């Protein structure tokens, strides 16, 4: 698949375990973030002593989540779960497993 | 050019007017941000009443961006203290006609 970068939000829709999520492609971030409002209440989260330069000691998924795209590619991520975010943010942890590259005509 | 996305910071080096800057490709941002620490003191910046999710400074002028293949255009970045890296937003990336692709 191909997605030009424009003024519009670059987005991907995929599954984490059994649930569909939509998020912003976020090359700027090492790690994936799910906004607390999209986080399934029954899925366990845990404190971390990680710090995110961009929210200190954020929550993270207790378990690894199986990501799956619409072509049935899959892998594991363990996202951070952050309160008061407008959008999910797909980081380079996920993007790299989907073998996504950036290219210019030139 | 082609750059796989990996754990390493995806970076671009280019000119804004006469000066070289290096930064992180930041698809998540509408607008480009330059570290106040890298910002030439003689280049004017202005208050805004915009918030970036606050009241940040922005370049008073449009800056001519130029890459190493001599593609060019205009951006007007925000200028923010206390960031570790410059951040290339979609204002710049869209003018460079950058695509994301997967095998």
């Amino acid at each position: 698949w191909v997605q030009p970068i424009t003024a519009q939000k670059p987005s991907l829709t995929l599954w984490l375990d059994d649930k569909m999520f939509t998020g912003l492609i976020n090359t700027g971030a090492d790690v994936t973030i799910i906004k607390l409002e999209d986080w399934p209440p029954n899925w366990p989260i845990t404190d971390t002593l990680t710090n995110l330069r961009g929210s200190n000691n954020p929550k993270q998924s207790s378990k690894y989540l199986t990501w799956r795209d619409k072509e049935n590619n899959s892998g594991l991520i363990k996202p951070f779960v952050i309160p008061n975010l407008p959008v999910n943010l797909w980081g380079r942890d996920l993007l790299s497993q989907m073998k996504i590259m950036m290219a210019s005509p030139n | 050019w082609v750059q796989p996305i990996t754990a390493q910071k995806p970076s671009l080096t280019l000119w804004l007017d006469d000066k070289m800057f290096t930064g992180l490709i930041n698809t998540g941002a509408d607008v480009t941000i330059i570290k106040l620490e890298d910002w030439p003191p003689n280049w004017p910046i202005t208050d805004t009443l915009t918030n970036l999710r606050n009241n940040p400074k922005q370049s008073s002028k449009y800056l001519t961006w130029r890459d190493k293949e001599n593609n060019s255009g205009l951006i007007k970045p925000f200028v923010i203290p206390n960031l570790p890296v410059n951040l290339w937003g979609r204002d710049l990336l869209s003018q460079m006609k950058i695509m994301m692709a997967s095998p």
Binding site: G28, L52, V87 | L24, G28, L52, P84, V85
Partner: peptide, 7 residues
């Protein structure tokens, strides 16, 4: 404008 970086 929304600005989504972090180590």
């Amino acid at each position: 404008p929304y600005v989504f970086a972090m180590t």
